[PDB]
Design a protein around this ligand. Sequence first.
Ligand SMILES: Nc1ncnc2c1ncn2[C@@H]1O[C@H](COP(=O)(O)OP(=O)(O)NP(=O)(O)O)[C@@H](O)[C@H]1O
Ligand SMILES: [Mg+2]
Ligand SMILES: [Mg+2]
Lengths: 19, 339
Amino acid sequence: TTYADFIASGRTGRRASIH
Amino acid sequence: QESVKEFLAKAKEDFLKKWETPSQNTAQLDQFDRIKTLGTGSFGRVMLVKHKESGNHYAMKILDKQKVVKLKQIEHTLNEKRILQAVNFPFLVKLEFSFKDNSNLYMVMEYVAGGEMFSHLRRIGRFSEPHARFYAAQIVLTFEYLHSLDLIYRDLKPENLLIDQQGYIQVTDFGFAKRVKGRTWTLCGTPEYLAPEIILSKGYNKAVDWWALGVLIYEMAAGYPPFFADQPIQIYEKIVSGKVRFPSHFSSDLKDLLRNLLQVDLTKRFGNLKNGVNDIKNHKWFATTDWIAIYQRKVEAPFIPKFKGPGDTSNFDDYEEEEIRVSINEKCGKEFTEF
Ligand SMILES: Nc1ncnc2c1ncn2[C@@H]1O[C@H](COP(=O)(O)OP(=O)(O)NP(=O)(O)O)[C@@H](O)[C@H]1O
Ligand SMILES: [Mg+2]
Ligand SMILES: [Mg+2]
C-alpha cells in the first residue's frame, strides 16, 4: 500500500527546510 | 466582499508602518530563564523560556549569527524578522520581542503549547476531511492576508503549523518569507512542498504558496504527501512529472480541489487565476465553510490539545539540550545592524 511504502521510507520524521 | 476589501486596506496601512520602521531591541537575554528545547533546526533552536518580570512563558528562537552567515542566510534572516514584527493576523504567531547579542539573534514569540500539527498528524495517521478543511480554511485566509501585503510565505508544512489552546492554527517560521512585487528565484522551502517552477529554476511568484496548500491538504487528508521518496532528488522528479494519485477514501470534491491546486500549469492553478483566492473559497469542497466564522474563531475546533498548565511541553518531542554560548567579541555586527 502507499501508506506502507511511506511508513517504510526515510522521510516520515520532521523535515528540515532547504535553501 | 466590501468588508474584506476595507479590512485589507487598513491591514496594509498597519503593516507598511511597521515594515518601514521596524521594532528593534525590545528585550535582552537575561530577562528570561531558558527551560527546554521545543524544536531544533539548521541555525539553532526554539526554546521554551519564562520571562522573569511577567512570569509569562514564550518560545525563543535562537539563531547563531556565524551559522547564518556560513549558510548565506543573512538576507533571509533579516526578511524573517522584519516581516514577522510587522504582520498581524489571527493565525500568525505573534512576535513579542526581538534582540541580538554578540553571538546570536533572538525572536521571542507567543508560546503555542498545542505542539506541531506534524506530531498529531503522524500519531493519529490522517485527519478526516472536515478536520483537514478546518485547518485548510485558516491557511487560505492567512495567504489571502499575506499575499495582499506582497508577501510570499514559502515554507508551508505541518512542522511549521502549531495548534493553539483553542485548536486553531498559528503559523510559525517566517524564515523564507519575502516581500516581492515581481518574480523571485531562490531555491528554498521543504522538498515535498516545492512547486515545480521552484525546482525548474524558473522565476516564480505567490502561486507557489497555493501549490504548497495543495500538498498540505493532501498530506493532512491522506497521512502522507502526494510526492514522497527516500531522497529529495527523487521527490523533485515526481513533482515535475506532476502525476498525482489519490487515496480511495478521498471525496470527489477533494480530488477536484487538489487537481486544481497541484496544477503544473500556472494559467490553470487555483489561487493564480483572474478570480484569485475566490476560486478556492468558492470551491465545492469548502461549501460548508463559514469564512468569517473561521476568521472570528467562532467555529468549534475538531481537536483540542491536552494542556496541563503553564510551561507544559507534553505536546512536543524532547530534544538534546546545548549550552547557549555568548562570545565576549561581537560577531557579524554590521551584517545584522537592522535586526
Ligand atoms: N511560537 C512557538 N510556539 C511553540 N513552538 C514553536 C514556536 N515556534 C517554533 N516552535 C517549535 O520550534 C520548531 C522550530 O522552529 P522554526 O522556526 O520552524 O525553526 P527553523 O530552523 O526555521 N526550521 P525549518 O526551517 O522548518 O527547518 C518548530 O517546528 C516548532 O516545533
Ligand atoms: Mg521550521
Ligand atoms: Mg525555517
